[PDB]
Every structure is written in C-alpha cells, then in structure tokens.
Amino acid sequence: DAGMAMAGQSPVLRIIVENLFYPVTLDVLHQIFSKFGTVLKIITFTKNNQFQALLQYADPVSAQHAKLSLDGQNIYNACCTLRIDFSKLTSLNVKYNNDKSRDYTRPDLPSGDSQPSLDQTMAAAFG
RNA sequence: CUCUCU
C-alpha cells in the first residue's frame, strides 16, 4: 500500500502480549494489520511464559502507522490490546505451520507433509 | 532487564 507521504524504514514486527492463544493469531494479525498496509509473513510462539507473534510487511510506512495505532492502544471492546514494536532481525523467515509459522505468498505453507515422487524418489523400489 | 536456526 504505502499510501502515506511520511517516512518509514523498519518492515517487521515483534507483536507481544496479544489477546490470543494459537495460530489463528497470525491470520488475525493479517485481518487487523491489513487495515493499515500489506502484511506479509507471520510466526506464532509462546515466548516461554508469554505469548508472541512475529510479522513482516511489504511496507515499513504502513508498519510505522500500525505501531503508532496498535502499540499506542487497542481499537474496540478492550479486545485488541497488542504490544507491537520493530525487530532486530528485520527480515523474518517462515518455517512451517507445523508448530511455528506461515506465509501468504507461499501456498499456505504446508506442514512438512509433502509426498515422494516415484519417477525419481522411491523409483528404485516404488512398491 | 523480552523477538522463531519446524
């Protein structure tokens, strides 16, 4: 998006101490951060005893605007009370929605399920 | 005294 004339240069987030519990979080961060800009790719971990998510954007100017608007406060019904801040990494790396993370320019990711191919993989035996 | 090498 980047539809604002002001500065911005940190395209990825810590998103800590959310209202949240599991990987629905990431698609919900997508659904509420889409209101600011072009959210990209997400992690979801229990940070030892806290909860956290970890998200990259397209546009650091929209991500500025969302840190502004969502680090400063929630949005409605006392129900969106995020801590949200820029990373030290500043280019987040997805793994798998197996236990950790998905990406939306990837398929869905998979979960590591992906099968053999009996032309080339099992082909020495195949059955 | 805070941020995933499934």
User: In this structure, is residue A119 part of a structural domain?
Assistant: no
A45: nearest nucleotide, CA–C1' criterion: B4
Task: Examine residue A123 and state whether it is found in any structural domain, yes or no.
Answer: no
Q: Is residue A120 part of a domain?
A: no
Q: Determine the structural domain holding residue A76 and report its residue range.
A: 6-113
Task: Decide if A49 is inside a domain.
Answer: yes
The total of structural domains in chain A comes to: 1
The contacts of residue A9 (CB under 8 Å, 6+ apart) are: A60
Would residue A53 count as lying in a domain? yes
Q: Which two tokens stand for residue A56?
A: 């990259």
Distance in angstroms, CA of A99 to C1' of B5? 15
Instruction: Give yes or no for a contact between A103 and A58, defined as CB atoms under 8 angstroms apart.
Output: no
User: What is d(CA A30, CA A57) in angstroms, rounded to the nearest whole number?
Assistant: 10
CATH number at residue A43: 3.30.70.330
The C1' atom of B3 and the CA atom of A109 lie apart, in whole Å, by: 22
Backbone angles phi, psi at A23, to 5 degrees: -65, 80
Resolved by:
NMR
CA of A85 to C1' of B3 (A): 9
Instruction: Calculate the alpha carbon distances from A75 to A31, A44, A67, A102 in Å.
Output: 13, 21, 12, 25
Q: Is residue A127 part of a domain?
A: no
* Residue A122 counted as domain residue: no
In a domain, A42, yes or no: yes
- Give the nucleotide nearest to A89 (CA→C1'): B3
**Residue A70 burial (10 A CB sphere; 0-12, 13-18, 19+):** buried
